[PDB]
Amino acid sequence: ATQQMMQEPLTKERLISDWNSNVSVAVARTTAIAKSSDASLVQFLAADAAATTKSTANVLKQIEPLITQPAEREILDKIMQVRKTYIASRDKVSQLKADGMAEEAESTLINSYVPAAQGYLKLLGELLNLQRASLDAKAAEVEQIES
Amino acid sequence: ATQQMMQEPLTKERLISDWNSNVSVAVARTTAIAKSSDASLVQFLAADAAATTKSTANVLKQIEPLITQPAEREILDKIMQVRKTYIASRDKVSQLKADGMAEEAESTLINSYVPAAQGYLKLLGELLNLQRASLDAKAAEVEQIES
Amino acid sequence: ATQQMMQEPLTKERLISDWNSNVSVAVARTTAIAKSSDASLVQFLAADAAATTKSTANVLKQIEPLITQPAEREILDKIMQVRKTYIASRDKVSQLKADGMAEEAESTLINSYVPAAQGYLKLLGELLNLQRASLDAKAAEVEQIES
């Protein structure tokens, strides 16, 4: 019969996919915060980042009870450390820009934020590829439990 | 056994938290609409506000069947009045800006929009603190129904 | 008793409503991408469009198993063709702008993107009105199955 056993792996995959995409948009938003001469837009984009941080934290709290295998748990903990580095460097370019220190805002973006964002993205990509391998294994043997 | 009785209070809390955050980002978006010299961006941010209004209205229609106690119902009705004032003042700065009346757009933002947004935010904060007190009371006696 | 038979038509309606709204905001975002002199903002808005494309594709994959009647299925297939035209013209103004060809970015916006977006919006409106007629018919005879 219709096997809805495939909804934890599907949900994990879809969450992680969205997470990867959102981080990529954040890279461009943080760049705009650092580089833009339009102050009202910079404030709006910083406020937006403050909201998306909570959105991400809550997706974290959703997904982490589902991540139970050793390799994915290891990747997840790594992501959780690089995320601290990332949030700190992003909030530093934001705080610098908001205080009229644009040159430092860009020096922090290039020298600290982008490397952290790249590590974050590498780890997210790894987790997603891992999760697709897991989702296919789990679907194959749900089909062999239905066979 | 696992007591999923804790999902109406949790859902109410998470919705209201998100609502509070979104209003804070709206304050910054409306400010950009009023102050920015970049017309295409102003149009994009006004279109965005028109979408988030529907998103909020539909969250309202989600949450209001769950709000049943007298103090929270009172707060909710207050919010529903201040929201009319808020939407009207926000749409007025938008309409003024779209018609080339920037000076009035900013005078309306400062003299009418920001006060309304502050009242809205005060009421949302109250509702969230109320809902956290309710969520803890309800979890404590779900644990005493499991004891 | 409480008849939750009304949740497929309600869900379809709410998804399609949101889809219509999001396309309207995309029209304004693509216009900003084409017209704005602020390069960092243009990059951020293009990255955002790349994320919302996946969001829409996944809403498509959600809704299409629910669309089973001939008139709505016909509208849906039409939308799926106009969406290819739309994504191509939007990505062309984006790619042109990112490469320093602003004049062509605006000529493509006006001569190719806006017409496609208008067709897309016409079809989405049709689908939503269709879905409201279907939702009312289905609710009326769920009430006559409860009568």
Side-chain angles (χ1 to χ4, degrees):
Chain A
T2 74
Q3 217 75 23
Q4 223 81 344
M5 314 205 264
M6 279 300 96
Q7 250 206 291
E8 208 197 297
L10 277 174
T11 292
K12 276 164 75 193
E13 193 260 322
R14 187 79 91 82
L15 287 165
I16 297 170
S17 195
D18 291 359
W19 191 0
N20 187 88
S21 265
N22 294 333
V23 168
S24 284
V25 171
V27 168
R29 191 192 49 204
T30 307
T31 299
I33 289 171
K35 288 168 148 251
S36 178
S37 38
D38 190 329
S40 35
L41 162 70
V42 167
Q43 289 186 331
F44 162 66
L45 290 174
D48 185 64
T52 67
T53 290
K54 315 176 192 357
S55 182
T56 285
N58 292 331
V59 158
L60 257 178
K61 284 279 164 225
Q62 194 184 355
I63 48 95
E64 201 246 339
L66 322 165
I67 291 178
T68 84
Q69 302 317 354
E72 67 175 345
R73 201 159 34 89
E74 175 217 68
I75 306 283
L76 189 50
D77 312 1
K78 273 173 216 224
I79 291 169
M80 281 171 347
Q81 264 79 256
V82 168
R83 198 186 165 238
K84 306 176 209 158
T85 301
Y86 167 92
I87 293 296
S89 93
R90 183 245 277 148
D91 291 346
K92 187 54 70 202
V93 316
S94 190
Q95 164 210 314
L96 291 173
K97 182 59 175 280
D99 297 339
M101 299 183 262
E103 290 152 48
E104 240 238 319
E106 195 176 349
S107 164
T108 296
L109 177 101
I110 280 152
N111 291 336
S112 313
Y113 178 75
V114 158
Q118 291 175 343
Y120 195 10
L121 282 167
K122 186 172 195 153
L123 287 169
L124 278 165
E126 301 176 17
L127 195 55
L128 181 64
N129 304 319
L130 184 42
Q131 180 50 42
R132 292 182 176 147
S134 157
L135 161 72
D136 267 20
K138 222 144 155 160
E141 286 157 318
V142 159
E143 288 142 7
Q144 185 148 353
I145 273 167
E146 206 214 0
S147 312
Chain B
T2 74
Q3 217 75 23
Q4 223 81 344
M5 314 205 264
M6 279 300 96
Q7 250 206 291
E8 208 197 297
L10 277 174
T11 292
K12 276 164 75 193
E13 193 260 322
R14 187 79 91 82
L15 287 165
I16 297 170
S17 195
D18 291 359
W19 191 0
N20 187 88
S21 265
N22 294 333
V23 168
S24 284
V25 171
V27 168
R29 191 192 49 204
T30 307
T31 299
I33 289 171
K35 288 168 148 251
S36 178
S37 38
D38 190 329
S40 35
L41 162 70
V42 167
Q43 289 186 331
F44 162 66
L45 290 174
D48 185 64
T52 67
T53 290
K54 315 176 192 357
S55 182
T56 285
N58 292 331
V59 158
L60 257 178
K61 284 279 164 225
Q62 194 184 355
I63 48 95
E64 201 246 339
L66 322 165
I67 291 178
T68 84
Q69 302 317 354
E72 67 175 345
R73 201 159 34 89
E74 175 217 68
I75 306 283
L76 189 50
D77 312 1
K78 273 173 216 224
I79 291 169
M80 281 171 347
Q81 264 79 256
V82 168
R83 198 186 165 238
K84 306 176 209 158
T85 301
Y86 167 92
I87 293 296
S89 93
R90 183 245 277 148
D91 291 346
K92 187 54 70 202
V93 316
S94 190
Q95 164 210 314
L96 291 173
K97 182 59 175 280
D99 297 339
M101 299 183 262
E103 290 152 48
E104 240 238 319
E106 195 176 349
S107 164
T108 296
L109 177 101
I110 280 152
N111 291 336
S112 313
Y113 178 75
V114 158
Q118 291 175 343
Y120 195 10
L121 282 167
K122 186 172 195 153
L123 287 169
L124 278 165
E126 301 176 17
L127 195 55
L128 181 64
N129 304 319
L130 184 42
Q131 180 50 42
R132 292 182 176 147
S134 157
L135 161 72
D136 267 20
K138 222 144 155 160
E141 286 157 318
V142 159
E143 288 142 7
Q144 185 148 353
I145 273 167
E146 206 214 0
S147 312
Chain C
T2 74
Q3 217 75 23
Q4 223 81 344
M5 314 205 264
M6 279 300 96
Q7 250 206 291
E8 208 197 297
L10 277 174
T11 292
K12 276 164 75 193
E13 193 260 322
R14 187 79 91 82
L15 287 165
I16 297 170
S17 195
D18 291 359
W19 191 0
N20 187 88
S21 265
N22 294 333
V23 168
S24 284
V25 171
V27 168
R29 191 192 49 204
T30 307
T31 299
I33 289 171
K35 288 168 148 251
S36 178
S37 38
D38 190 329
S40 35
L41 162 70
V42 167
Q43 289 186 331
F44 162 66
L45 290 174
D48 185 64
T52 67
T53 290
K54 315 176 192 357
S55 182
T56 285
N58 292 331
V59 158
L60 257 178
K61 284 279 164 225
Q62 194 184 355
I63 48 95
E64 201 246 339
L66 322 165
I67 291 178
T68 84
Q69 302 317 354
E72 67 175 345
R73 201 159 34 89
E74 175 217 68
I75 306 283
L76 189 50
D77 312 1
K78 273 173 216 224
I79 291 169
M80 281 171 347
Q81 264 79 256
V82 168
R83 198 186 165 238
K84 306 176 209 158
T85 301
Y86 167 92
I87 293 296
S89 93
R90 183 245 277 148
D91 291 346
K92 187 54 70 202
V93 316
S94 190
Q95 164 210 314
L96 291 173
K97 182 59 175 280
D99 297 339
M101 299 183 262
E103 290 152 48
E104 240 238 319
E106 195 176 349
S107 164
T108 296
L109 177 101
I110 280 152
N111 291 336
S112 313
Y113 178 75
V114 158
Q118 291 175 343
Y120 195 10
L121 282 167
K122 186 172 195 153
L123 287 169
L124 278 165
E126 301 176 17
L127 195 55
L128 181 64
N129 304 319
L130 184 42
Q131 180 50 42
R132 292 182 176 147
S134 157
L135 161 72
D136 267 20
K138 222 144 155 160
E141 286 157 318
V142 159
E143 288 142 7
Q144 185 148 353
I145 273 167
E146 206 214 0
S147 312

